[PDB]
Design a protein around this ligand. Structure first.
Ligand SMILES: Nc1nc2c(ncn2[C@@H]2O[C@H](COP(=O)(O)OP(=O)(O)OP(=O)(O)O)[C@@H](O)[C@H]2O)c(=O)[nH]1
Ligand SMILES: Nc1nc2c(ncn2[C@@H]2O[C@H](COP(=O)(O)OP(=O)(O)OP(=O)(O)O)[C@@H](O)[C@H]2O)c(=O)[nH]1
Lengths: 149, 427, 99, 427
């Protein structure tokens, strides 16, 4: 969400329910993030990907979308790690899978290897304070111990 | 300016408000996130009536969510647009209502009323000047009724120059699952009539009827029920927020609508309902618009007015109309049935036209008619109250709260007085 | 636009977006600048799937200035006008941590 | 020029001073190593209000830490910015106080007050002409009161012409873990009310409350609480350091806020507290700023000013405001409660407005108020003093130390006079 003014990044969990092709969005309430105790983000339900353009006879002013309108729903065939995907005006990056997932895909949908990509953020290290050089009045070895803390 | 702040109460009212809010956002063009896609100058022109403005091009509703049950609020927040409402307004508690109106009205009242008053008044001085508030709840709903009683009773005095609009859904004449429902409903209506001014009454049996009539899709959801009722009050509110020639003030409507104070309860009716082939099999002609409007099938609140008689009828239109055709159609209907409009006052029709078609269909409207067709409703519910008060069954919970049967007695007396003058003013 | 977007007709009983933030000037320029912001943020969140100091100038400063810029007192013996003007350049070389 | 010197006493001080100095270092963009990474011309301009300067660029603070516990200063030096503190300034002792006020007031001071006075005078000759000194101590903290009473008493006649800012944490009305705390507090507050000119009194209970109100991170860290209080106190200092149309002087503030010689104890008030959603969900503007600013919950010092009345209120603002909106806001609140001021003194408001906002936020403020909401605090502590001097339990430590009960009697007499004095000037 770095595009917005005070945005940030978070991480969530997608459960594809096989038995009904529904989708969901979990959440990570780790600790002390400010965020409210709240399990879900979007509940387990159906998602219309691509529609038709003549829903004037069937306006959203009346009954929402149905079999008569949808061009195609979000198939399990679409989820791929290594390319962003868009939903409800949000686009996500998928990076990690599970061993069960990557073995299920290798035979059912016939999917080759896709290793996870390190999406983490890194920083360099700092350095310790050294000794203000030999003043000439001390001892080149004892003044070290003296001028530490 | 002159604006409104919304009140939603009760577990059904939760769904009601969710669908109604998403419909408003949909027609105003706001995306799922809240950063709107500039297309419509006028809907940018008149949004300060409902939406308020913060940074980042977002538009929060001034809606306050009151509840006792964590799961319901969790779901509604988890819905498609819950990110548009505020944890500030997510005022809630931890104790079940018990679906006991006494519990909801006295013991759980005090610990909530303070906080809810805090939030509502903070929003109040945040805004400039209300016309008032619409309060969407269920007189058949335990939490809704119990909390609505106290909230309306207090909200009366502080700001007594505004408009306390109310929406509630009347219990089904065939089933309620809740069996203490008649008691809850009367305990609510006694103060409803005392305090408020305008009430929209609705029943779900007619919704199912219309599902068989024209919706025809055989697998409905309370989502679609909320969808249609949201369409209805969106239509009644459409007048304020657009340019054009018509009066918009709900106070104008009320003074046009209500002859005597004691009458407060009204039956809405909606404009074209369509089926799969009809969406292009149908002739969008103002004549058939008026026909299907006035048809008793199209009504969805209580019952057929064919038993009773009309007092005031007001229909507000939306689209690229002209005056003369709606005028002459009123002429036609008044002549067609002039013997069913009371001799009391002729010209009981009130019209007004907004000129911005809804997205998806050009000609549309909405209708509200105050008619003496609720006698069936309240007569039946009165016999239910009497026939379950004969032997005071299911009353130990109420005694445990500490109530007394007199309150029931005087509430019923008030309700029968309403019955009497309802019958008399037209008979 | 339609009629005018640079201005929205004085005494506009309607409202505008971008009420807070840049504000506190005359009306018409506020209208122009505010709607400029309203299409700026527009395309900024559009961004479709991207993943797919006059205090000192050339000749130093006036006498009797207060506020410690780095140094001075450590160096001295010059006319204060000079001192300031020469600090104006050596604030680029040795005390270059001034920006 | 004009400058201030900071004193850090007790472990409350050892807490605060560290957090506070690193806060100001971040404000002026000083790296932990102490070498400036230039971002703000003006902060270079007025870094000299607090920080002296040494060859090589480093930015020493004009503060002195003092305590009796070597481990705590070892820990603060282990902290991130300990290198921004001087071995010469580190004045300390060989012994632990045992958290006894008389131990801090008669015996252990006799071998440290001399050294600390020498330090303060060498720093005074280093500087030109101080506006004064500020102190972070705890009135019930063991070592803090014992050291502070002595050092302030000496420095008073040392420099009879300056500003002695005193900042203390109030003992919790519910939890201390210190059982002689009432005794220490009363003994200290005697000399405090005798000598001081200005004192901010703060407590941690309201910090916990505000944590569960707006922090919304459940379990906080005392360091974060220090962040909040240091934010307050930096904010009250911000008047000196910046250009803009305002009236910096703390002396301006004192004559603006003090009706009589014997009033010193004031209650901080902070400006917007922003939480998880509010960063996207707040319309940062003067109206809401004023609203939340004068909220009986967002005050954090002692207790609700509701039971009493406000005498004087001053508001420091920070940002690109205009004085018309602050004027109208002040008038509006004045009329909102013209009942809870005093006809005694009308228009009891003071305003300062700086144009240099804090970093990471645009429109903000700080509040200070002197109301009659302290009677209950020193009341409670006085009656606890009565209940525990009733049987003079635990008295043996202090008797062996070598103090006498006539001091207790005189101190409680002075506190009773304070109680009365507060009571009559508003009632
Ligand atoms: N949301 C919803 N409410 C329904 C539906 N059918 C009937 N209702 C009634 O609408 C009532 C209003 O809900 P609330 O006002 O929140 O009820 P409550 O105060 O929590 O107490 P109860 O009515 O006992 O549940 C519900 O109690 C139901 O009795 C439905 O399909 N959906
Ligand atoms: N840094 C720090 N200070 C704390 C913490 N918790 C409480 N304090 C406060 O510090 C107060 C005392 O500070 P001091 O003035 O230094 O007290 P003292 O005279 O040095 O000795 P004691 O009061 O016995 O601890 C306690 O009463 C606490 O209220 C904490 O977690 N960290």
């Amino acid at each position: 969400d770095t595009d917005s003014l005070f945005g940030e990044c978070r991480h969530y969990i997608i459960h594809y329910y096989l038995m009904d092709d529904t989708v969901e969005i979990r959440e990570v309430h780790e600790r002390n993030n400010g965020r409210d105790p709240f399990p879900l983000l979007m509940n387990r339900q159906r998602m219309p990907k691509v529609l038709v353009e003549n829903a004037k006879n069937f306006p959203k002013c009346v009954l929402e979308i149905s079999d008569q309108e949808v061009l195609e729903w979000y198939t399990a065939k679409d989820f791929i790690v290594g390319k962003p995907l868009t939903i409800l005006g949000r686009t996500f990056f998928i990076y990690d899978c599970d061993p069960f997932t990557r073995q299920f895909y290798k035979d059912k949908f016939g999917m080759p290897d896709l290793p996870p990509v390190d999406v983490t953020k890194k920083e360099p290290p700092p350095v310790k304070q050294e000794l203000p050089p030999y003043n000439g009045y001390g001892l080149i070895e004892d003044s070290a111990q003296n001028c530490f803390a | 300016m002159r604006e409104i702040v919304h009140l939603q109460a009760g577990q059904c009212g939760n769904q009601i408000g969710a669908k109604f809010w998403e419909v408003i956002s949909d027609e105003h063009g706001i995306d799922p996130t809240g950063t709107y896609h500039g297309d419509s100058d006028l809907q940018l022109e008149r949004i300060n009536v409902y939406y308020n403005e913060a940074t980042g091009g977002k538009y929060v509703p001034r809606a306050v969510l009151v509840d006792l049950e964590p799961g319901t609020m969790d779901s509604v927040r988890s819905g498609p647009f819950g990110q548009i409402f505020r944890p500030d307004n997510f005022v809630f508690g931890q104790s079940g209502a018990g679906n006991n109106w006494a519990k909801g009205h006295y013991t759980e009242g005090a610990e909530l009323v303070d906080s809810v008053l805090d939030v509502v008044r903070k929003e109040a001085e945040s805004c400039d000047c209300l016309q008032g508030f619409q309060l969407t709840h269920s007189l058949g709903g335990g939490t809704g009724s119990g909390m609505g009683t106290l909230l309306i009773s207090k909200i009366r005095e502080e700001y007594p120059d505004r408009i306390m609009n109310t929406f509630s859904v009347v219990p089904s004449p065939k089933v309620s699952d809740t069996v203490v429902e008649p008691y809850n409903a009367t305990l609510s209506v006694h103060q409803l009539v005392e305090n408020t001014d305008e009430t929209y009454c609705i029943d779900n049996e007619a919704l199912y009827d219309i599902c068989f009539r024209t919706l025809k899709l055989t697998t409905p959801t309370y989502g679609d029920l909320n969808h249609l009722v949201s369409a209805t009050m969106s239509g009644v509110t459409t007048c304020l927020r657009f340019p054009g020639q018509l009066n918009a003030d709900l106070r104008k409507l009320a003074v046009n609508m209500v002859p005597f104070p004691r009458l407060h309860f009204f039956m809405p009716g909606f404009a074209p309902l369509t089926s799969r082939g009809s969406q292009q099999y149908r002739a969008l002609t103002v004549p058939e618009l008026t026909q299907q409007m006035f048809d008793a099938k199209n009504m969805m609140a209580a019952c057929d007015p064919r038993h009773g008689r009309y007092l005031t009828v007001a229909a507000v239109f939306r689209g690229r109309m002209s005056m003369k055709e709606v005028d002459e159609q009123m002429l036609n209907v008044q002549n067609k049935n002039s013997s069913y409009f009371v001799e009391w006052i002729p010209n009981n029709v009130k019209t007004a036209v907004c000129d911005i078609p809804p997205r998806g269909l050009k000609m549309s409207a909405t209708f509200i008619g105050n008619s003496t067709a609720i006698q069936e409703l309240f007569k039946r519910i009165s016999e239910q109250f009497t026939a379950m008060f004969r032997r005071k069954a299911f009353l130990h919970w109420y005694t445990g709260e500490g109530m007394d049967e007199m309150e029931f007695t005087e509430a019923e007396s008030n309700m029968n007085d309403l019955v009497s003058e309802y019958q008399q003013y037209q008979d | 636009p339609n009629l005018i977007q640079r201005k929205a007709i004085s005494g506009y009983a309607g409202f505008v977006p971008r009420f807070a933030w840049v504000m506190g000037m005359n009306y018409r320029d506020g209208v122009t600048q505010a709607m400029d912001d309203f299409d700026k943020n527009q395309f900024v969140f559009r961004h479709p799937v991207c993943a797919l100091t006059t205090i000192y100038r050339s000749q130093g400063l006036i006498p009797f200035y207060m506020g410690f810029i780095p140094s001075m007192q450590d160096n001295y013996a010059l006319t204060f006008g000079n001192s300031t003007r020469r600090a104006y350049q050596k604030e680029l070389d040795r005390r270059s941590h001034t920006l």
